Design an enzyme around this catalytic site. Structure first.
Site, PDB file in Angstrom:
ATOM      1  N   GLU A   1      96.127   2.691  23.095  1.00 15.49           N
ATOM      2  CA  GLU A   1      97.322   2.058  23.641  1.00 15.49           C
ATOM      3  C   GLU A   1      98.492   1.934  22.683  1.00 15.49           C
ATOM      4  OE1 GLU A   1      96.490  -1.558  25.858  1.00 15.49           O
ATOM      5  OE2 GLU A   1      95.178  -0.475  27.300  1.00 15.49           O
TER       6      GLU A   1
ATOM      7  N   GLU B   1      90.114   3.136  30.588  1.00 17.07           N
ATOM      8  CA  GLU B   1      89.924   1.723  30.889  1.00 17.07           C
ATOM      9  C   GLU B   1      90.431   1.487  32.312  1.00 17.07           C
ATOM     10  OE1 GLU B   1      91.651  -1.200  28.242  1.00 17.07           O
ATOM     11  OE2 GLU B   1      91.088  -0.056  26.418  1.00 17.07           O
TER      12      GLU B   1
END
Length: 305
Positions: free
Chosen positions: A133, A240
């Site tokens: 991320e 995710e």
């Protein structure tokens, strides 16, 4: 048989307590339990993503030597997954940052990645994830950091392994096409780049609420990304995703996965957030035998396994 190339879970804990560096194993962080991973494998899961902190694995300078004791547990965790024939994703869960400062040196990051990849170079079931991320940072930098990672990995002779690349904007699927278009220019002489996106189902896509926006929000939020992958001849993974154990989220999860199952030319699969031993009553826990998602979500994932 399985619907996707890969379907499994995050195995969180080595990255816990990140305000304490190095911190203390068993107090601030913990490694995954191989016994409960075994249970998830028996349910059909074939990929396990292992977050860790860059600073704990390679302290102070990312061009330095690894920490032997934290490395030992990363190796043990990874090789226990691959010894069972599952894929293990090595995830420096670092947000494009090292001691909370943006990684501004691709060359430093390349050396980090040669170091890491050299620990796994002959294991074809390890998957290298460049960083979790990236966000709030220069878009060309994000491209260059991903490329530096790939270059470092392949320079170590780790040529058999897939590499999960992550974009800016917290690698969100819903925001992919207008943020991360430049990521199409990544190169890999092994031709094993997978574009890893994350997709949560709550209002702001942060994955912090058990409440989902609607029963179709997952499909909706990955549709643009699906077209981008196809138009660019790329492959993706949802590295995710999660939703609460409730009707609207379960419907959204099924809808999203069913949509993905219609688009397997681009989608290689999905990885739930999260299993691991220190989640307790966490709204998204996939940890056997008593995590709420293990009990109430895994039955809606089984059709894909």
């Amino acid at each position: 048989a399985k619907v996707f190339q890969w379907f499994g879970s995050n195995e969180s804990g080595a990255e816990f307590g990140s305000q304490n560096l190095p911190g203390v194993e068993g107090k601030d962080y913990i490694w995954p339990d191989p016994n409960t991973i075994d249970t998830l494998i028996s349910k059909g899961m074939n990929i396990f993503r292992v977050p860790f902190m860059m600073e704990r694995l390679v302290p102070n300078s990312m061009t330095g030597s690894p920490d032997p004791n934290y490395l030992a547990d990363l190796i043990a965790t990874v090789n226990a997954i691959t010894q069972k024939g599952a894929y293990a994703v090595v995830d420096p869960h670092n947000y494009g940052r090292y001691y909370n400062s943006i990684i501004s040196s691709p060359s430093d990051f390349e050396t980090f990645w040669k170091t890491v990849a050299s620990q796994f170079a002959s294991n074809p079931l390890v998957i290298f994830d460049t960083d979790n991320e990236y966000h709030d940072m220069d878009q060309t930098l994000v491209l260059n950091l991903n490329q530096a990672a790939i270059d470092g990995i392949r320079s170590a002779g780790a040529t058999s392994q897939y590499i999960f690349v992550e974009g800016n904007s917290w690698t969100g699927a819903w925001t992919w096409t207008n943020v991360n278009d430049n990521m199409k220019s990544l190169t890999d002489p092994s031709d094993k780049i997978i574009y890893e996106m994350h997709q949560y189902l709550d209002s702001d896509g942060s994955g912090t609420s058990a409440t989902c926006v609607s029963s179709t929000i997952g499909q909706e939020r990955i549709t643009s990304a699906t077209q981008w992958l196809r138009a660019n001849g790329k492959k993706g993974i949802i590295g995710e995703f999660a939703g609460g154990a409730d009707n609207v989220c379960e419907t959204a999860i099924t809808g999203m996965l069913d949509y993905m199952a219609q688009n397997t030319d681009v989608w290689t699969g999905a990885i739930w957030w999260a299993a691991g031993p220190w989640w307790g009553d966490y709204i998204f826990s996939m940890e056997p035998d008593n995590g709420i998602a293990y009990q109430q979500i895994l039955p809606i994932l089984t059709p894909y396994l």
